Every structure is written in structure tokens, then in C-alpha cells.
């Protein structure tokens, strides 16, 4: 059944069987449904719940023109890079939040889903780029990256490397090296007198 009053398919996002690599982070637009964010904010399921530009308690009291749910997997030490005004391999070359970000960053440890004896090498990140990502920009190119002044000619080697590197998610990794699943909810608010909404 489908009706505009049903609960948002947040299950499809949070509980998805597979996540996207952070270099090719997924974006799911959320429309025609009802949500209880106060239930998400108070869930112990999430070890990271940080909202920016709006308080989590009043998310249900506001009106939005659009809501996105971006998701990906990084390693645990990199969770702090999913925030405004951060730098690092993830914030510079994979997923960038704008300084005026309006929304929430949610993350939980997914060692029991994404780790694999011998290493799960599905999840990958961008290691080399010529310039930093603009906010909310996505670069999924796999062209040979050129370091030195010599041209690359589409092949790995001297000062010419593949731009992506795979995490090797093993269950016995340290927590900083364990996979974490991230959902980033960003909102675009209605221009309206506060009297309305």
C-alpha cells in the first residue's frame, strides 16, 4: 500500500543490507511521508547524533521543502570528519559538508555487518585528488591520478596511482579502524512567517 501519510521509509536507509562506498556516497530523497525524528534522536542504536543549524527536538515542528538522506561507510576514526569545517581524506576527497550545513550527522558501529574474515574490501575511499571537494559534491571518477609532472597515460606506476583505496574491514580491527555506517540528513526549510511553521 501507498499513502502520503505512511511512515517515511527510513528503514530502507538505516537498515539497508549494503551501503555505498564513501567516495560514491548514496543520496536518497525523502518525500510524501511522515517522520518522528525525536524517535531517531533518542535511539541508543546510534553512537553519533549531531545536528547543525537546527535543534533535533524541533525537527518534527518544522516545515521542509526537501530532505535528503546521504549514506556511506567510513572507518571509525573518520567519523569526526563528517562535520562542518573539517579536513582529512574523507572531508577533502569524498564527502564535504558546507559551513552552513542544516541537518544531522548520524553514525553507528557496523562491525557485525560490514566486516569479514580476511577483510571486506567492498568499501573504498578516494585517496588522491587534485583539489578539495566542494560541499555535497560527488566524485566517482577512477582515472589514473597524476602526482609528478610526468603524464600518466592511463596506467599505474611512477607518480601515477589509482585514486581509490579499499578499507580492509576485519572484525578484529581496532575500533578506530572498524566500519561505521553514516546517515546525513540535510533539510531545506520553508520560507514562512514563524506563526505558520
Amino acid at each position, epitope marked *: 500500500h501507498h499513502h502520503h501519510t505512511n511512515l517515511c521509509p527510513f528503514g530502507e536507509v538505516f537498515n539497508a543490507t549494503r551501503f555505498a562506498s564513501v567516495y560514491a556516497w548514496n543520496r536518497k530523497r525523502i518525500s510524501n511521508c511522515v517522520a518522528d525524528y525525536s524517535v531517531l*534522536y*533518542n535511539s541508543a542504536s546510534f*553512537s*553519533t*547524533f*549531531k*545536528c*547543525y543549524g*537546527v*535543534s*533535533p*527536538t*524541533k525537527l518534527n515542528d518544522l516545515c521542509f521543502t526537501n530532505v535528503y538522506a546521504d549514506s556511506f561507510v567510513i572507518r*571509525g*576514526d573518520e*567519523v*569526526r570528519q563528517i*562535520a562542518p569545517g573539517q579536513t582529512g581524506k574523507i572531508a577533502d576527497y569524498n564527502y564535504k559538508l558546507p559551513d552552513d550545513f542544516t541537518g*544531522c550527522v548520524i553514525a553507528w558501529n557496523s562491525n557485525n555487518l560490514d566486516s569479514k574474515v580476511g577483510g571486506n574490501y567492498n568499501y573504498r575511499y578516494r585517496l588522491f585528488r587534485k583539489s578539495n571537494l566542494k560541499p555535497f559534491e560527488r566524485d566517482i571518477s577512477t582515472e589514473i591520478y597524476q602526482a609528478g609532472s610526468k603524464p600518466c597515460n592511463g596506467v599505474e606506476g611512477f607518480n601515477c596511482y589509482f585514486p581509490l583505496q579499499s578499507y580492509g574491514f576485519q572484525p578484529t580491527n581496532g575500533v578506530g579502524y572498524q566500519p561505521y555506517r553514516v546517515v546525513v540528513l540535510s533539510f531545506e526549510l520553508l520560507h514562512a512567517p514563524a506563526t505558520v511553521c
Partner: nanobody
Amino acid sequence: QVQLVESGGGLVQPGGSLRLSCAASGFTNDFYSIAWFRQAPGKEREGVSWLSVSDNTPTYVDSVKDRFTISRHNANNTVYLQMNMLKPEDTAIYYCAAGRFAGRDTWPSSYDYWGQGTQVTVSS
């Protein structure tokens, strides 16, 4: 500018209480969050209680759930951690941290502002 001043620790017997205080000054608005990290001898920093100030939302780990109570007194701009039924396990250097967001995080690297912590030791 932003500075976290810390006090309230000491020695207590197993079962006693203790009141920690974290004084946050230099914040322009109430849109920040406070966390309490404790560092057992040799262990890493682990968070035990959180308070998002703008919306007044506390959070605890299960291990201190019914024993600790976090609150803020709006007058003195200070966040209090009431530690009751202390156990020898709770012995650690307790820190208070802060970040420019509304919410909570388990990763110390998500908090930009720290204060040299107070010692809490529980034995008999």
C-alpha cells in the same frame, strides 16, 4: 575564548556520591553540547554522559544509567554530573568536553574543546 573549567573530584568510598561541575564560558549561544569522558588507568577515553544544551537532552551509557544524572544550571552556565552509588570501576580521570553542535558523539575527536580533568578515585 571558549574555556571549560572543571572541579568536583576527589576520593570516596564504594557507595558514596560525588558532584562534578563543568563551567563553559565563551559560547555565543546555547547551541553547543557537553560530554563527560573518563580515562581509566591505561584505557582510552570513553564517554559516560552527554547533554545537548540547546534542547536540554541528556544521554547516558548503560553502565551508569541509573547512577549518574547530568544537568545544567542556566544561571551559572555550568553543567553538573551527579555521581551516586560510585563503584571501584568508576575510578578514572573525568574530563568534560564541548562541541559546536546539538547532540552527542562517542568519539573524543568530535569535541574541539576540553578541560584538564578532575581525578575521581573510589576505594576503601
